[PDB]
From Swiss-Prot, chains A, B:
Entry binding sites for Mg(2+): D306
UniProt keyword annotations, A-Z: Acetylation, Glyoxylate bypass, Magnesium, Manganese, Metal-binding, NADP, Oxidoreductase, Phosphoprotein, Tricarboxylic acid cycle
Complex and partners: Homodimer.
Gene: icd
Lineage of the organism: Bacteria, Pseudomonadati, Pseudomonadota, Gammaproteobacteria, Enterobacterales
Positions annotated to bind D-threo-isocitrate: S112, N114, R118, R128, R152
UniProt EC number: 1.1.1.42
Name recorded for this polypeptide: Isocitrate dehydrogenase [NADP]
Entry comment on modification after translation: Phosphorylation state of this enzyme is controlled by isocitrate dehydrogenase kinase/phosphatase (AceK).
Cofactor: Mg(2+); Mn(2+)
Binding-site list for NADP(+): T103, H338, G339, T340, A341, P342, K343, Y344, N351, Y390, R394
Annotated residues for binding of Mn(2+): D306, D310
Residues found modified as N6-acetyllysine: K141
Length: 415, 415
């Protein structure tokens, strides 16, 4: 028996010709999130409602609908109901949803709930923009030079979760097949050996890279960088790079720069020549620190995207305010990107900035760009005013310490 | 017919009871390296010779012996002789060797020559210390807080080079086996799909972690951090973490801190309690920027170690002066960690700091700690004096620009 309540007032968003049809009163599913989700989610709801109200003068209003996943789901639906089938159904049905951080249990063989949501809903784009907000305390000298957008492939790579435990019958079966049937000789220690599988496909790669290039065109960005470790992993990471460049050539008229390998893609709207290039992943983690201004849109595989998004967020002082979206062809799920921080849960203390900026991304995705712009403006003003939560304030002199809820108010005040 | 010349004066280092027996006149094989190897290698030879001469008053002297790998090997031994068998034999026979950067060709199905050397010689430790040298221009505000030592597992992980090309008979054979025999359902796109294998073993893990803990004890370090992505890759990365903690318990008397999971290991020489802890890899790339002082010795798998060593090097301004060793139970190969930078090759321009500090590590490994200390002192003085190569100088005001060879002289001058 479902415990979700469909709002009496509200219409569902629909999808036609690859375009969202968003009514003035859209029903938006939201997952509160565990731990500090109880603090940041109500701040997000208030801030989004204010931005919507101010932008469209009361003509538009979101009908929020609570749905369940994580620790709260077990309390609502019962033991071991960590991810109800209806949550998958509802997100797909209502097209656009948002969630706080999620608790994935240990000891019950349950894999990451975040990853489960991404994979089961085929949300193959993990979209993570990282920019600097003036006034944010940062560990680097020039965080303002960082303005990048990560397209992280969300459906393949070693995240597929194909692996077998050392000394298990399955692992030994796989290892025997590799050694005796594939003639594999390069497993250093075949005994007591865990095994993981890393897939990378042409279709998987190209749908991700296609979205990254379309984003660069739509938003007049300067370049798309394919980041990969293709010199060591030729047939997965290296193939990702090859297919990315091929896609730029075959679908976007990519032309060779100089003697290559970089390509230029002409923006059909602005005439700007978008550079398509590539960087080896370890070097890239250096280049984002040393030459951040040379990078813009980034396209990379699942694990590399995980690392890159964290590293970039840290450097701009944005560990706790990094927005994120998981986008597929039929629906999209925006998310707080930090953890659940249970020690602070319910103290109205932690930074709601991440889930709020994810909500900004959500509004933009819905075509409600005015409301989204108001959130960005409010976030810029509040941070610039040094009226901030403890995680910022502890690193600054002369800041005003705000509760989580109060920081939400400051954002609204600066819209 | 070998083109290596064994020095008439010189004795080979031997190994007894796991201890190097280094004579006063050791023969040390060296690989010049391709590209800028022609610049940095002679600077290294001069600097090492000066340090040895000054430390031991002419009682000791290295008999350098050139051996071949990379582009130079093809010119010495002929077409497609990129890595002669004798080079493997010689490094093993002479126990301690050093190399400049290597060119690995593209288009001939040759995998990384660096990786080949590590794997064929079973040099399972990639040892990369990263500290700050005062005066170095850095992109971060507090690089002096970074003083870490990376133990990167060098023999397993996705570096095993087990993989098959998309649409190849082999890949399809593997994919069929996975789907039909292992009942694998989580490959999103089984067609046009490259496949890689990720092994992690108990013996591989423990020999690496054992070296990391022994290093912490020997050098009175504060903690060993196991870095892994075990929440997603349970049976490889997660197993690495489990086996690392288990090793600390079973071999080093590790005791539980509080309610865990951190352990304390008592240094048998100093009484210091060494903390054994762990951090998820994406978070770790944040924590090295945000809380670098909380980290010391790091133990991690091959790919993560690749990324971590690059990220740390970048942050301390050490991209071009990061030392590295590849150490096994029978021999050790110290290396320039940067690339070959062919555009500057032969211009006496690039920074010899990396290969010089790798040589410092080499001398220390040989038990010639006085000579090693002189190199560290000379490097500290030269950099502090702002008498530096262009890669530093271009980022500074009021520095004196030195050629590669001149920077080597400055190091000697500051010993
Ligand atoms: Mg992550
Ligand atoms: Mg590397």
């Amino acid at each position: 028996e479902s415990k979700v309540v469909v709002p009496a007032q509200g219409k569902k968003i629909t999808l036609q010709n690859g375009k969202l049809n968003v009514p003035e009163n859209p029903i938006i599913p939201y997952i509160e999130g565990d731990g500090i989700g109880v603090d940041v989610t109500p701040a997000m709801l208030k801030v989004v409602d204010a931005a919507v109200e101010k932008a469209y003068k009361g003509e538009r209003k979101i009908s929020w609908m609570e749905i369940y996943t994580g620790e709260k789901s077990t309390q609502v639906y019962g033991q071991d109901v960590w991810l109800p089938a209806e949550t998958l159904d509802l997100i797909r049905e209502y097209r656009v949803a948002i969630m706080g951080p999620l608790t994935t249990p240990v000891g019950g063989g349950i894999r990451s709930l975040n990853v489960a949501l991404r994979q089961e809903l085929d949300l193959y784009i993990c979209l993570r923009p990282v920019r600097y907000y003036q006034g944010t305390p940062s560990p680097v000298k020039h965080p303002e030079l960082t303005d990048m957008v990560i397209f992280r492939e969300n459906s393949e790579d070693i995240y597929a979760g194909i692996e077998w435990k050392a000394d298990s019958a399955d692992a030994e079966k796989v290892i025997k097949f590799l050694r005796e049937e594939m003639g594999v000789k390069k497993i250093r220690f075949p005994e007591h050996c865990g095994i993981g599988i890393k897939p990378c496909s042409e279709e998987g790669t190209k749908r991700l890279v296609r979205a990254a290039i379309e984003y660069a065109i739509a938003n007049d960005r300067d370049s798309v960088t394919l980041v990969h470790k293709g010199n060591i992993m030729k047939f997965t990471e290296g193939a990702f790079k090859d297919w990315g460049y091929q896609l730029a050539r075959e679908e976007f008229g990519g032309e060779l720069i100089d003697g290559g390998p970089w390509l230029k893609v002409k923006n059909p709207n602005t005439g700007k020549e978008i550079v398509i290039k590539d960087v080896i992943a370890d070097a890239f983690l250096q280049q984002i620190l040393l030459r951040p201004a040379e990078y813009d849109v980034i396209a990379c595989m699942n694990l590399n995207g995980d690392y890159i998004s964290d590293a970039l967020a840290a450097q701009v002082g944005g560990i706790g305010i990094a927005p994120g979206a998981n986008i597929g062809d039929e629906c999209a799920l925006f998310e707080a990107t930090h953890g659940t921080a249970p020690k602070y849960a319910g103290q109205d203390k932690v930074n709601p900035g991440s889930i709020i900026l994810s909500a900004e991304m959500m509004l933009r995705h819905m075509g409600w760009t005015e409301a989204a712009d108001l959130i960005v403006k409010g976030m810029e003003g509040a941070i610039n005013a040094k009226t901030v939560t403890y995680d910022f304030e502890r690193l600054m002199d002369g800041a005003k310490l705000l509760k989580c809820s109060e920081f939400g108010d400051a954002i609204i005040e600066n819209m």
